[PDB]
């Protein structure tokens, strides 16, 4: 049943030194910098930063929110929890 990751998919994404973080697979706009091969453009909710990650660091949101979706002290985390639950597809400019 699982497919490859696609723009709009909601995830927790893992960065070194950070808790699993609410995020989405982003689109790539025309003329924008493309990701390296086998990586995805990840938009992190709350901080609104972007990084390029491979699937080993991407966890489906609905399967893993009971484990990763509790509030955390790190800057922007609880804001990101609100975004992913309440408007995950908005433009955060
Ligand atoms: Br983890 C995370 C949450 N927001 N931003 C990040 C991040 C951390 C490191 N490098 C790029 C982006």
Swiss-Prot record:
Widely expressed. High expression is found in heart, skeletal muscle, ovary and testis. Overexpression is frequently observed in hepatocellular carcinoma samples. Residues 7-64 form the PWWP domain. Changing residue 21 to A: Loss of interaction with histone H3K36me2. It is found in: Nucleus; Cytoplasm. Interacts with HDGF. Interacts with trimethylated 'Lys-36' of histone H3 (H3K36me3). Interacts with trimethylated 'Lys-79' of histone H3 (H3K79me3), but has higher affinity for H3K36me3. Interacts with IWS1. Interacts with H2AX, POGZ, RBBP8 and CBX1. Interacts with histones H3K9me3, H3K27me3 and H3K36me2. Interacts with DPF3a (isoform 2 of DPF3/BAF45C). Interacts with SMARCA4/BRG1/BAF190A, SMARCC1/BAF155 and SMARCD1/BAF60A in a DPF3a-dependent manner. Belongs to the HDGF family. Acts as an epigenetic regulator of myogenesis in cooperation with DPF3a (isoform 2 of DPF3/BAF45C). Associates with the BAF complex via its interaction with DPF3a and HDGFL2-DPF3a activate myogenic genes by increasing chromatin accessibility through recruitment of SMARCA4/BRG1/BAF190A (ATPase subunit of the BAF complex) to myogenic gene promoters. Promotes the repair of DNA double-strand breaks (DSBs) through the homologous recombination pathway by facilitating the recruitment of the DNA endonuclease RBBP8 to the DSBs. This is Hepatoma-derived growth factor-related protein 2. It comes from Homo sapiens. The lineage of its organism: Eukaryota, Metazoa, Chordata, Craniata, Vertebrata. The chain holds residues 1 to 93 of 671 of the full protein.
């Amino acid at each position: 049943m699982p497919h490859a990751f696609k723009p709009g998919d909601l995830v927790f994404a893992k960065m070194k030194g950070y808790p699993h973080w609410p995020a989405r697979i982003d689109d790539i706009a025309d003329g924008a910098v493309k990701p390296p091969p086998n990586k995805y453009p990840i938009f992190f909710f709350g901080t609104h930063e972007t990084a390029f990650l491979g699937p080993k660091d991407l966890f489906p949101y609905d399967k893993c929110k009971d484990k990763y979706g509790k509030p955390n002290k790190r800057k922007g985390f609880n804001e990101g929890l609100w975004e992913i639950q309440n408007n995950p597809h908005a433009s955060y400019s």
